[PDB]
Design a protein around this motif. Structure first.
Motif, mmCIF file in Angstrom:
data_model
loop_
_atom_site.group_PDB
_atom_site.id
_atom_site.type_symbol
_atom_site.label_atom_id
_atom_site.label_comp_id
_atom_site.label_asym_id
_atom_site.label_seq_id
_atom_site.Cartn_x
_atom_site.Cartn_y
_atom_site.Cartn_z
ATOM 1 N N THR A 31 0.814 -1.142 -0.048
ATOM 2 C CA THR A 31 0.101 -0.050 -0.043
ATOM 3 C C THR A 31 0.786 1.203 -0.104
ATOM 4 N N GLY A 32 0.187 2.231 -0.347
ATOM 5 C CA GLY A 32 1.011 3.752 -0.227
ATOM 6 C C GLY A 32 2.057 3.969 -0.980
ATOM 7 N N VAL A 35 1.421 6.036 -7.806
ATOM 8 C CA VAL A 35 0.488 5.318 -8.674
ATOM 9 C C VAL A 35 1.433 4.461 -9.843
ATOM 10 N N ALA A 36 2.318 5.044 -10.091
ATOM 11 C CA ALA A 36 3.077 4.670 -11.532
ATOM 12 C C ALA A 36 3.814 3.243 -10.985
ATOM 13 N N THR A 37 4.063 2.879 -9.626
ATOM 14 C CA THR A 37 4.811 1.805 -9.022
ATOM 15 C C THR A 37 3.824 0.652 -9.359
ATOM 16 N N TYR A 38 2.575 0.903 -9.180
ATOM 17 C CA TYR A 38 1.588 -0.265 -9.345
ATOM 18 C C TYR A 38 1.455 -0.675 -10.933
ATOM 19 N N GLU A 39 1.446 0.404 -11.840
ATOM 20 C CA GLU A 39 0.977 0.356 -12.968
ATOM 21 C C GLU A 39 1.964 -0.396 -13.828
ATOM 22 N N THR A 40 3.259 -0.055 -13.413
ATOM 23 C CA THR A 40 4.453 -0.782 -14.134
ATOM 24 C C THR A 40 5.075 -1.988 -13.389
ATOM 25 N N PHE A 41 4.533 -2.501 -12.256
ATOM 26 C CA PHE A 41 5.098 -3.459 -11.470
ATOM 27 C C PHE A 41 5.078 -4.625 -12.042
ATOM 28 N N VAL A 67 -8.793 -3.590 -13.330
ATOM 29 C CA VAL A 67 -8.087 -2.920 -12.296
ATOM 30 C C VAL A 67 -8.338 -3.658 -11.017
ATOM 31 N N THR A 68 -7.132 -3.690 -10.172
ATOM 32 C CA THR A 68 -7.096 -4.433 -8.907
ATOM 33 C C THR A 68 -7.109 -3.250 -7.955
ATOM 34 N N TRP A 69 -7.936 -3.344 -6.913
ATOM 35 C CA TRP A 69 -8.260 -2.366 -6.036
ATOM 36 C C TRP A 69 -7.703 -2.330 -4.692
ATOM 37 N N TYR A 70 -7.386 -3.451 -4.055
ATOM 38 C CA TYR A 70 -7.121 -3.718 -2.680
ATOM 39 C C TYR A 70 -6.060 -2.909 -2.109
ATOM 40 N N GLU A 71 -4.794 -2.666 -2.771
ATOM 41 C CA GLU A 71 -3.944 -2.083 -2.130
ATOM 42 C C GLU A 71 -4.183 -0.584 -2.471
ATOM 43 N N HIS A 72 -5.222 -0.016 -3.033
ATOM 44 C CA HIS A 72 -5.476 1.333 -2.957
ATOM 45 C C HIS A 72 -6.838 1.579 -2.188
ATOM 46 N N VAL A 79 -11.200 4.237 -1.485
ATOM 47 C CA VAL A 79 -10.109 4.434 -2.524
ATOM 48 C C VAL A 79 -9.217 5.669 -2.327
ATOM 49 N N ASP A 80 -7.999 5.441 -2.529
ATOM 50 C CA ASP A 80 -7.008 6.447 -2.605
ATOM 51 C C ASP A 80 -7.480 7.559 -3.711
ATOM 52 N N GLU A 81 -7.631 8.687 -3.554
ATOM 53 C CA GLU A 81 -7.973 9.398 -4.680
ATOM 54 C C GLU A 81 -7.145 9.438 -5.863
ATOM 55 N N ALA A 82 -5.859 9.431 -5.669
ATOM 56 C CA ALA A 82 -4.987 9.452 -6.577
ATOM 57 C C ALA A 82 -5.024 8.269 -7.697
ATOM 58 N N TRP A 83 -5.400 7.043 -7.117
ATOM 59 C CA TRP A 83 -5.717 5.803 -7.754
ATOM 60 C C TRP A 83 -6.873 5.948 -8.555
#
Ligand SMILES: [Cl-]
Ligand SMILES: [Cl-]
Length: 346
Positions: A31-32, A35-41, A67-72, A79-83
């Motif tokens: 978590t935390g 955003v880009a860290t998830y998208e390119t993970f 879209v996978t939501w749990y870490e956001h 849901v984190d606003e940025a996500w």
């Protein structure tokens, strides 16, 4: 402007579809993070407008955005606003390009660590309010997009033991059917365009065996002709590793699938929300596969596309045709497969 249309009209307008897989569905960095860290993970590039434009300009009319939501989500399910804004931005890429787009709830289901939505009645009871709160936020955030945007409640829901064919306990189907109803209820309750937006519900595991189809219950909806059922197909399982050519057995396997789906679903459209060569251990085709194996991929895809068209259905390719560094060019990873699809559709 929102112009309401039947679920069948949508499906008939999808044409050739594509899954932007291993992208906003990528997960496991915790978590935390940025955003880009998830998208390119999982190795894909960050998504751009040019990618969606490339899809439309090259013969595709629909994109599924897993879209996978749990870490956001925080402990309260917020849901984190940025996500949310990044999901919104990629939707808008698709809208702008003229595409239909599907947004779902992805690796929150199935066999990965962190999946929390399961075809299990204890799990359903413990998570239903969090699931409805998740959908409310998604529906509210995406409320103002037109009829080209559809919502998909959940991806590949399994029981607590990750059983891929059918749940070990028949009660697992109650949990699935209840989540499907809650998804529809939560979305409809937000009103506006979401009162009539086309929504997609999936079978257990996105499978289509006899028991799975028999125990699927379509949600009750206050409006008519606005639900689609979704299944996935990588059949015959593991063919990419065991078949030389897309042969009679392969073809007969698919025709039987469409016949079973059409026979079952007489009052609603259905879609093949994923298909591809992915088999044992997710082993699949790439542009460095032997020419013969790329032909196998091409032949599967041509068959799938034509059969779906004949059955008033629609299909979404899982990843392989438009992958990794090819997305940023943009260019097809597997142009011979895309060409087989386009000519089958036309
Ligand atoms: Cl993981
Ligand atoms: Cl998969």
């Amino acid at each position: 402007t929102y112009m309401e249309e039947s679920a069948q009209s949508a499906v008939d307008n999808f044409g050739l579809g594509f899954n932007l897989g291993n992208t906003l569905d990528a997960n496991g960095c915790g978590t935390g993070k940025p955003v880009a860290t998830y998208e390119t993970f999982w190795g894909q590039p960050e998504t751009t407008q040019d990618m969606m434009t490339f899809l439309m300009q090259n013969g595709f009319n629909a994109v599924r955005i897993p879209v996978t939501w749990y870490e956001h989500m925080d402990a309260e399910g917020n849901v984190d606003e940025a996500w949310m804004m990044r999901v919104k931005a990629i939707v808008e890429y698709a809208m702008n390009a003229g595409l239909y787009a599907i947004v779902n709830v992805h690796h929150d289901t199935a066999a990965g660590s962190g999946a929390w939505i399961k075809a299990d009645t204890d799990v359903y009871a413990a998570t239903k309010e969090k699931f409805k709160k998740l959908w409310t936020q998604i529906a509210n955030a995406l409320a103002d997009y037109d009829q080209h945007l559809l919502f998909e409640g959940y991806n590949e829901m399994l029981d607590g033991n990750n059983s891929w064919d059918e749940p070990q306990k028949a009660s697992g189907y109650e949990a699935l059917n209840n989540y499907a109803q809650d998804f529809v209820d939560a979305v409809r309750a937000t009103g506006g365009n979401n009162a009539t937006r086309n929504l997609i519900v999936n079978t257990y595991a996105a499978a289509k065996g006899e028991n799975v189809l028999n125990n699927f219950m379509l949600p009750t909806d206050a409006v008519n002709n606005h639900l689609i059922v979704q299944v996935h197909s990588y059949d015959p399982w593991n063919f990419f590793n065991t078949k030389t050519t897309w042969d009679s057995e392969c073809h007969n396997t698919l025709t039987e699938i469409f016949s079973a789906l059409s026979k079952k679903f007489t009052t609603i459209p259905y879609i093949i929300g994923e298909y591809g060569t992915h088999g044992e251990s997710d082993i699949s085709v790439s542009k460095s596969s032997p020419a013969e194996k790329i032909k196998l991929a091409a032949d599967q895809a041509a068959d799938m596309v034509k059969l779906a068209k004949d059955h008033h259905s629609a299909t979404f390719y899982w990843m392989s045709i438009f992958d990794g560094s090819d997305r940023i060019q943009p260019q097809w990873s597997l142009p011979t497969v895309v060409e087989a699809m386009q000519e089958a559709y036309n």
